[PDB]
Design a protein around this ligand. Structure first.
Ligand code: CDL
Ligand code: TGL
Ligand code: HEA
Ligand code: HEA
Ligand code: PEK
Ligand code: PEK
Ligand code: PGV
Ligand code: PGV
Ligand code: DMU
Ligand code: DMU
Ligand code: CHD
Ligand code: CHD
Ligand code: CUA
Ligand code: CU
Ligand code: MG
Ligand code: NA
Ligand code: ZN
Lengths: 43, 98, 259, 58, 227, 84, 46, 46, 514
């Protein structure tokens, strides 16, 4: 496959941001629930 | 059980159904219901491919019972050849409508 | 402008309203069964009827009034209807399977016999035989209606179709009366279960098929059908024959062999 | 009864850009609005019923 | 019982389980052969710059790769079905024991002579005696005579359960209203463990089976003492 | 009997109408009389509280929860017996 | 030389081992010396 | 007629990559989070 | 404009896109559920302190992965996008009914989520066997909500099946026979026939379960003369075809992917492939009681189901060897899609072979309801279906979107996923052979090591999934627009550009009859 160069290039820094934010969106809510599992069981 | 009162397709068919019906009795096929028969496919006697525009996709079944169909855009102009078997196809634009 | 014969349909809200009506009917059944309220269910049933009405109205508009049903489109609908009937045959086969599983190996709780101890089956030679004659007769009359339509005979089509519908209604009232008169119930173990769920789903299909025929009656009154183009009628006739054949299997299996 | 299919054919083939489900006129718009109101209102009510059914009661 | 880091089946306690072990060895050899063959051919297809992209004739090749797999399947099927019909063949048991599944414990009934029955519960982890096995020990074990053909009848008084003992090659579903029969024969004395093998709710994981296999005379005395 | 009739040439609607009024509806009229004679509300059987019948695992979602949908007091007993 | 989205239905250039003579030339518009070079190509390549 | 071409044949906007990141994280993150919160909900009832 | 386009759609591509979006979202739900499973099992003891919750999670996992991830993506997503494009058709036969098939799914999913939220959930297993699923052992609305969820999904798929069969039979160019359609189109066709025949039987069974729960029927209740085993027959009569339904579109995609990245104009042995898929479809209806070898069935019946089940290896093998023969002599392009397909071929084969072990009812006595079965199906399903989906997604994403992925990132994603799934599932074979039951929240101490390793594997796959989301973002963020695609002469779906126009084939292809 051939393609044009990027219309809105995403730099290494921008990729780090995207990756970080993606990873956190999955990890933080589940993390919060799992960390607090003990609290929930007492209720 | 005999008597009348039911309309016929001649009387009541409309829109595209009617256009198909009328074209059919004149032996024409503007809505691509039938398979076209191939010519010999030479440069002198190319397959004539109607289009309402300046290009049309051709599928070439190079030999009878081939499972692989060869697909390519046929452009208006000089005859073009199937990239597999070399048979000639020529676009005949207008031929279909406006 | 297209140069194929197929029908590109206008964007439509009915798929979405139909899907949501499915949610309301199912969640409604749940609310009825568990939180004794009928409210969601009635909303669901209302929206389902509205959806069906408007959807099939639009199909009539597309075909009869707009001319989109070319032979190619019609051929597609023929496949569609056959495939739908096949899926319905398989639904019923599940119930037949259940009936034969239960009746061929009656368990100790039934007394080890079929019919179970305490069950007094209906006489297959009384109303069940009448029901059989009624649906068979309705197969003859619908075939008359079909042949009259194809021969261009408006009046006899209407007469034959009316007779067909009347027989359908008669079957339905006969079965409702039989239900009321039956000394066993749906709660009478596996005999009652298999009997009422199988014949009840059949009964639903009879009502559905009768409704379909009634639609065709009113479309014929309004001159929608031509002598060559009347798929709505053919579909309804295929469906009606399906209903009849299912009856015959029920009659032989449940009423006759299972008594 | 008389065959009025041609009148209907003319109505539904009118070049007014309306989709088939609104092309019969103002009544279509009304039936549509009733159907959609009941559907969406019913769906909201089902969500409320879920919320209510999701917790224990007095 | 399973031991830590185990890879294969538990050592066989019955001659039927021994048959299964050899049949598994046979089948696993074939499985490893086919999978490694496929992986190798893959690597072979992918490690050459040589090419051949024109249409290839398929007829000769499809004979080979239909007939060969068919033969292999027959080579699995023959010993498989031998064992199957071996399992089923006539036994003449000396004893019948019933087991009934419950949520979440097993009951046992030995009713050939006297009316002996009892319930068998998992020992809670907090009540295990030193050296006892978490999730596996029961209060009242299923005492049975060794080197004897036993008929087990399996059923349930509530939902589905399944009565299993891997080292004897046994698993029989426990279905209410039904009485399923399997045959049990231990070559050895000892303790042989199993666990409920149909999902039966909350405590599915916590209703084990423990057979205690002993000489007939010990079994007889135990029985009399359990009345 | 496959049937015992024989008829082809100029059939269509006329032939199917002939079958509708000559065979189909007469059959329905005959079965309607057979049923009108061999009905007449018959003896309700003696009640025995068999445990495989009158099943109640959950109350029904209408009425008092103990009556089936097409409950007929004459012939359908409750788990406790006939209503009177 | 610039390939545009609008050009999708046209024969295109590809570099492939198994399709060594592509449907179009790499360079369509020649400079004046490149055209003279193509003229010279019609004579002896030596 | 409807919009055609890249970034337009989709029910979400790709006009801004950071607004897109936000939408994608809410979309995928809400799916992934839901079972954790259902477990939580069931633990808190009883 | 938005509503008309996305809620009132009658366009196969847009509906396809909706299905892909739905499926992707469902995939996250399923993944999360999978991780909760492996968290509970990742050390000895209890994590959740509530095994009813564990059982609900297990049950939801399976329903989400099967009905809301795999089927919507493969049939709804790829099927709607690709089938009309591959046969030069202007849309599906029933474009409006197509839209209802899609819109039935969010309510189906809502019903399932409702089931997990009310009472204590449906902790039944995805089989939903009575009497555990009955009104005494699972009193209240949860199981009824689950059943209705399946009804909605059933209707969706049956209507979708009708649509696909009709489209494929009726809407090809007049010169194109069925033996000139691409293998993916065959794979959808055959899948559709299976759905059409299997789902109504499921619908019958679960409706009988519903009436047992609410109308005092006793189909499955011994007290009324019923039999729990009847439910199992009805369920599995659907359930086995279901697993072929889940893989067949995958086989179709793999044929295309392998062909394409081998630089071939056609798959090896086209008619053999068609034969193989039809044979697998047919045999898939006569093998179902291999799911019931421990219920107490007669020996001759066991012998029959053992033998018939094994026969399926013959046509499946023709496919496997034909993929290898397609590679053979290829100018191999080591694209990310190709890697997924090669992983598929090997992992599917491993999974298929453990299927053959299980077909032997004598061995299955010991292996049934153990982690050996769980290993079997996560190889053929989890890996097989998922690897085909991933390969298809990477391969066709530029067609659907008009944008390219970063191939290096995509290869990284594959590598991580390959490691993860194998670390997760390979050890489960050992667990199974050594007798660990399935559907357990906790295990005897001897099983700790393999469970520990398996749970660690599950986290590697989580990292792969998170990365996949980033990779898709990066593609939409960077906007590298596609210019040229090779091999369009034997891949018609690409010939209208990327993305194709809303309406394609308004003028149909021209194909001579020769
Ligand atoms: C237990 C028994 C078991 C037995 C078996 C069961 C049998 C039961 C059968 C019941 C179902 C029958 C359905 C038949 C529909 C017939 C339509 C037809 O074929 O004509 C084609 C007709 C062609 O007409 P056209 O003039 O050529 O032009 C069409 C154009 O579209 C342009 O026109 P249009 O389509 O826009 O609208 C034209 C419309 C005019 O348009 C309008 O202005 C208003 C339109 C409103 C539509 C209503 C929507 C219905 C859905 C609601 C669902 C909820 C239920 C509530 C019902 C409310 C009823 C209003 O025409 C009318 O005037 C219709 C009214 C006719 C009045 C007749 C009343 C008879 C009463 C008899 C009582 C007898 C008592 C005597 C006692 C005497 C003793 C003293 O096109 C259509 O209407 C579309 C047909 C769609 C068919 C699909 C139907 C699916 C069924 C599912 C829904 C079920 C409920 C619907 C029926 C409600 C009954 C009241
Ligand atoms: C499919 C995996 C792909 C690889 C991906 C890598 C990334 C993921 C990482 C994770 C990769 C880990 C690789 C370790 C392989 C070890 C296999 C083995 O030694 O197995 C031995 C058998 C023997 O059975 C027995 O009766 C046990 C008693 C006798 C032996 C035990 C002696 C005592 C030793 C105890 C200490 C040993 C320590 C533990 C040692 C255990 C190590 C885990 O075990 C069994 O029965 C198990 C039967 C499994 C059935 C699977 C069928 C599929 C065939 C294999 C596919 C690959 C083919 C290509 C050929 C392979 C090329 C890929
Ligand atoms: C994609 C989904 C999928 C596919 C394709 C399959 C494919 C097969 N499965 Fe699978 N299976 C499941 C998903 C699937 N399975 C699921 C989800 C369950 C669990 C249900 C539940 O309880 O929840 C299950 C359970 C299941 C059981 C029940 C076990 C038990 O519960 O005790 C059995 C029994 O026979 C079985 C066998 C097979 C066989 C013989 C194949 C064959 O189709 C495989 C054929 C393929 C090959 C053999 C590999 C390629 C062939 C060759 C390379 C040729 C050479 C090979 C030989 C000569 C052998 N599997
Ligand atoms: C398609 C079906 C499917 C898939 C993909 C999975 C995926 C996974 N499953 Fe499985 N599972 C089942 C079907 C599936 N499963 C079934 C039917 C059961 C039986 C339930 C029962 O007993 O009742 C089961 C049971 C089961 C058990 C046994 C529970 C028990 O017996 O108690 C375990 C244990 O580890 C497990 C783990 C996993 C893990 C770790 C993954 C994954 O995490 C592995 C990695 C894969 C992914 C993370 C998938 C990612 C895909 C997407 C995100 C979609 C992307 C979309 C686009 C690109 C458009 N699942
Ligand atoms: C014990 C319990 C049982 C309980 C119930 C009992 C019985 C139920 C039976 C009910 C049937 C009753 C009434 C139905 C009556 C008439 C409907 C048929 C009308 C008709 O006329 O059918 C014809 C046959 O077609 C066709 O089978 C087209 C078929 C479409 C494809 C179907 C594919 C799916 C089926 C899978 C089978 C395998 C396919 C084998 C392919 C071999 C091809 C040579 C139509 O031909 P056509 O050229 O397609 O038409 C034009 C376009 N359709
Ligand atoms: C006029 C002809 C008679 C039939 C039609 C009229 C009324 C019934 C309405 C709908 C029937 C639809 C489906 C059949 C379902 C269940 C069986 C009901 C059939 C029936 O009507 O049986 C009656 C019981 O009704 C009952 O319990 C309850 C009846 C009403 C509540 C049923 C609600 C449950 C519906 C289940 C929906 C799921 C189906 C999904 C389909 C699959 C889609 C993929 C029998 O009466 P009884 O007093 O026990 O015995 C007679 C004593 N003299
Ligand atoms: C007391 C009241 C209770 C009411 C309950 C029942 C309610 C509704 C069910 C009734 C079904 C009515 C279906 C009406 C369909 C009308 C539309 C129609 O028939 O449309 C026709 C096309 O066929 C087509 O869509 C074919 C479409 C056929 C649809 C098949 C319908 C079956 C639906 C059954 C649902 C099953 C549920 C089962 C439960 C398990 C239009 O083409 P023609 O006829 O060729 O006309 C064109 C010519 O005029 C040109 O010259
Ligand atoms: C308790 C559980 C509750 C579940 C509720 C069910 C869910 C939703 C209910 C909502 C249904 C109401 C809406 C009516 C649908 C009509 C479908 C139809 O009639 O679709 C037709 C195609 O199918 C055909 O023919 C073949 C005919 C197919 C008819 C389909 C009717 C509904 C089917 C429901 C039952 C399915 C199977 C049940 C048994 C297993 C027409 O296709 P369109 O693309 O529209 O147009 C094409 C145009 O060229 C026509 O001009
Ligand atoms: C199976 C799916 C994968 C799960 C793996 C998740 C990896 C972890 C991601 C981080 O998650 C966070 O972890 C913090 C702890 O490190 C938590 O803070 C908690 O603990 C902190 C310190 O103890 C306090 O400051 C906070 O108030 C308290 O909420 C916080 O809630 C949680 O969101
Ligand atoms: C596939 C679709 C199936 C459709 C199912 C249709 C079932 C019809 C049920 C009929 O029930 C009757 O109608 C009353 C209502 O009209 C009920 O009132 C009952 O139910 C109400 C629920 O709203 C309560 O408020 C009342 O107090 C309570 O008496 C009453 O018992 C009963 O005689
Ligand atoms: C009104 C119409 C007159 C002729 C026409 O419009 O073509 C006639 C022709 C056929 C008639 C119908 C048919 O004879 C069948 C039915 C016969 C019943 O005795 C009256 C109602 C019945 C439903 C009739 C009503 C009405 O008189 C119809 C519909
Ligand atoms: C006859 C048919 C179609 C040939 C064609 O028209 O192109 C071909 C296609 C696939 C073939 C089958 C498959 O190749 C698999 C089998 C291969 C064995 O060598 C013969 C039987 C075998 C079962 C084949 C018989 C027959 O030659 C089939 C069924
Ligand atoms: Cu008892 Cu699992
Ligand atoms: Cu199976
Ligand atoms: Mg089991
Ligand atoms: Na645990
Ligand atoms: Zn050619």
């Amino acid at each position: 496959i051939t393609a044009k160069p990027a219309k809105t290039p995403t730099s290494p820094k921008e990729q780090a941001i995207g990756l970080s934010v993606t990873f956190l969106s999955f990890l933080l809510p589940a993390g919060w629930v799992l960390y607090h599992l003990d609290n929930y069981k007492k209720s | 059980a005999s008597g009348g009162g039911v309309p016929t397709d001649e009387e009541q068919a409309t829109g595209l159904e009617r256009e198909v019906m009328l074209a059919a009795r004149k032996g024409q096929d503007p809505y691509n219901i039938l398979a076209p028969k191939a010519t010999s496919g030479t440069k002198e006697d190319p397959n004539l491919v109607p289009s309402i525009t300046n290009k049309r996709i051709v599928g070439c079944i190079c030999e009878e019972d081939n499972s692989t169909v060869i697909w390519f855009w046929l452009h208006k102009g000089e005859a073009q050849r199937c990239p597999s078997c070399g048979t000639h196809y020529k676009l005949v634009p207008h031929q279909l409508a406006h | 402008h297209q140069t194929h014969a197929y029908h590109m349909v206008n964007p439509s809200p009915w798929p979405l309203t139909g899907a949501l009506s499915a949610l309301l009917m199912t969640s409604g059944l749940t609310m009825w069964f568990h939180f004794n309220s009928m409210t969601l269910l009635m909303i669901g049933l209302t929206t389902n009827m509205l959806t069906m009405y408007q959807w099939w109205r639009d199909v009539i508009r597309e075909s009869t009034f707009q001319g989109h049903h070319t032979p190619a489109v019609q051929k597609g609908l023929r496949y569609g209807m056959i495939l739908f009937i096949i899926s319905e045959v398989l639904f019923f086969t599940g119930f037949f399977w259940a009936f034969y599983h239960s009746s061929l190996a009656p368990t100790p709780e039934l007394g080890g016999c079929w019919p179970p101890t305490g069950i007094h089956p209906l006489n297959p030679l009384e109303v069940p035989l009448l029901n059989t004659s009624v649906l068979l007769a309705s197969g003859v009359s619908i075939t008359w209606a079909h042949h009259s339509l194809m021969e261009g005979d408006r009046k006899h089509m209407l007469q034959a179709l009316f007779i067909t519908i009347t027989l359908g209604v008669y079957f339905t009232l006969l079965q409702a009366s039989e239900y009321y008169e039956a000394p066993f119930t749906i709660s009478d173990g596996v005999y009652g279960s298999t009997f009422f769920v199988a014949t009840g789903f059949h009964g639903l299909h009879v009502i559905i098929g009768s409704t379909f025929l009634i639609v065709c009656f009113f479309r014929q009154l309004k001159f929608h059908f031509t002598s060559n183009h009347h798929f709505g009628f053919e579909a309804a006739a295929w469906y009606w024959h399906f209903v009849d054949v299912v009856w015959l299997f029920l009659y032989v299996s449940i009423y006759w062999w299972g008594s | 009864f008389e065959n009025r299919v041609a009148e209907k054919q003319k109505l539904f083939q009118e070049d007014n850009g309306l989709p088939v489900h609104l092309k019969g006129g103002a009544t279509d718009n009304i039936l549509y609005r009733v159907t959609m109101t009941l559907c969406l209102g019913g769906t909201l009510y089902s969500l409320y019923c879920l919320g209510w059914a999701s917790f224990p009661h007095k | 019982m399973a031991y830590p880091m185990q890879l294969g089946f538990q050592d066989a306690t019955s001659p039927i389980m021994e048959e299964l072990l050899h049949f598994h060895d046979h089948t696993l050899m074939i499985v490893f052969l086919i999978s490694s063959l496929v992986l190798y051919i893959i690597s072979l297809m992918l490690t050459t710059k040589l090419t051949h992209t024109s249409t290839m004739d398929a007829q000769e090749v499809e004979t080979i790769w239909t007939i060969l797999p068919a033969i292999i399947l027959i080579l699995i099927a023959l010993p498989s079905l031998r064992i199957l019909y071996m399992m089923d063949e006539i036994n003449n048991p000396s004893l019948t024991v019933k087991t009934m599944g419950h949520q979440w414990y097993w009951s046992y009934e030995y009713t050939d002579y006297e009316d002996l029955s009892f319930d068998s519960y998992m020992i809670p982890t907090s009540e295990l005696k030193p050296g006892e096995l978490r999730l596996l020990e029961v209060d009242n074990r299923v005492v049975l005579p060794m080197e004897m053909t036993i008929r087990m009848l399996v059923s349930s008084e509530d939902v589905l359960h399944s009565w299993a003992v891997p080292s004897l090659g046994l698993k029989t579903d426990a279905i209410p209203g039904r009485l399923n029969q399997t045959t049990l024969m231990s070559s050895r004395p000892g303790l042989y463990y199993g666990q409920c093998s149909e999902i039966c709710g909350s405590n599915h994981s916590f209703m084990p089976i423990v057979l205690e296999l002993v000489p007939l005379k010990y079994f007889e005395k135990w029985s009399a003492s359990m009345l | 009997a496959s049937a015992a009739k024989g008829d082809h040439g100029g059939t269509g609607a006329r032939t199917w109408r002939f079958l509708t009024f000559g065979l189909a509806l007469p059959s329905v009229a005959l079965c309607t009389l057979n049923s009108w004679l061999h009905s007449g509300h018959r003896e309700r059987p003696a009640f025995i509280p068999y445990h495989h019948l009158r099943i109640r695992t959950k109350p029904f979602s209408w009425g008092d929860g103990n009556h089936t949908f097409f409950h007929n007091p004459r012939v359908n007993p409750l788990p406790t017996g006939y209503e009177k | 030389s610039v390939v545009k989205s609008e050009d999708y239905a046209l024969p295109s250039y590809v570099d492939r081992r198994d399709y060594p003579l592509p449907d179009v030339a790499h360079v369509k518009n020649l400079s004046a010396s490149q055209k003279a070079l193509k003229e010279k190509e019609k004579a002896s390549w030596s | 007629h409807y919009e055609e071409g890249p970034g337009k044949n989709i029910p979400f906007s790709v006009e801004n990559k950071w607004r897109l990141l936000a939408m994608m994280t809410l979309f995928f993150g809400s799916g992934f989070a839901a079972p954790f919160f259902i477990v939580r909900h069931q633990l808190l009832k009883k | 404009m938005f509503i008309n386009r996305w809620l009132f759609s009658t366009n196969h591509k847009d509906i396809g896109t909706l299905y892909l979006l739905f499926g992707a979202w469902a995939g996250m739900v399923g993944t999360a559920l999978s991780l909760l499973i492996r968290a509970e099992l990742g050390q000895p003891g209890t994590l959740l302190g509530d095994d009813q919750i564990y059982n609900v999670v297990v049950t939801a996992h399976a329903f989400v992965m099967i009905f809301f991830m795999v089927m919507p993506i493969m049939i709804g997503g790829f099927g709607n996008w690709l089938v009309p494009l591959m046969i030069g058709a202007p849309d599906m036969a029933f474009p409006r009914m197509n839209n209802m098939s899609f819109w039935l799914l969010p309510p189906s999913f809502l019903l399932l989520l409702a089931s997990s939220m009310v009472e204590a959930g449906a902790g039944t297993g995805w089989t939903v066997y009575p009497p555990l699923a009955g009104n005494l052992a699972h009193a209240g609305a949860s199981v009824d909500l689950t059943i209705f969820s399946l009804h909605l999904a059933g209707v969706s798929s049956i209507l979708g099946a009708i649509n696909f069969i009709t489209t494929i039979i009726n809407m090809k160019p007049p010169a194109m026979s069925q033996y000139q359609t691409p293998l993916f189109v065959w794979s959808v066709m055959i899948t559709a026939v299976l759905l059409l025949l299997s789902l109504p039987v499921l619908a019958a069974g679960i409706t009988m379960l519903l009436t047992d729960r609410n109308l005092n029927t006793t189909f499955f209740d011994p007290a009324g003369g019923g039999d729990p085993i009847l439910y199992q027959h009805l369920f599995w009569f659907f359930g086995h075809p279901e697993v072929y339904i889940l893989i067949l579109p995958g086989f179709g995609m793999i044929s295309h992917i392998v062909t394409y990245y081998s630089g071939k104009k056609e798959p090896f042995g086209y008619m053999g492939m068609v034969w193989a898929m039809m044979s697998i479809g047919f045999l898939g209806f006569i093998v179902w009681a291999h799911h019931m070898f421990t219920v107490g069935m007669d020996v001759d019946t066991r012998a029959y189901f053992t033998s018939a089940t094994m026969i399926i290896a013959i046509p499946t093998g023709v496919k496997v060897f034909s993929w290898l023969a397609t590679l053979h002599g290829g100018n191999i392009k080591w694209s990310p899609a190709m890697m997924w397909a090669l992983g598929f071929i090997f992992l599917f084969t491993v999974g298929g072979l453990t299927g053959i072990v299980l077909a032997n009812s004598s061995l299955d006595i010991v292996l049934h309801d153990t982690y050996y079965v769980v290993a079997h199906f996560h190889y053929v399903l989890s890996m097989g279906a998922v690897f085909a989906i991933m390969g298809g997604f990477v391969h066709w994403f530029p067609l659907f979107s008009g944008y390219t992925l970063n191939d290096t990132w995509a290869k990284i994603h594959f590598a991580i996923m390959f490691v993860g799934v194998n670390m997760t599932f390979f050890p489960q074979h050992f667990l199974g052979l050594s007798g660990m039951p399935r559907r357990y929240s906790d295990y005897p101490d001897a099983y700790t090591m393999w469970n520990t390793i398996s749970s660690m594997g599950s986290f590697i796959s989580l990292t792969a999934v998170m990365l996949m989301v980033f990779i898709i973002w990066e593609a939409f963020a960077s906007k590298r627009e596609v210019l040229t695609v090779d091999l369009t002469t034997t891949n018609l779906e690409w010939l209208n550009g990327c993305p194709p126009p809303y309406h394609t084939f308004e003028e149909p292809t021209y194909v001579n009859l020769k």
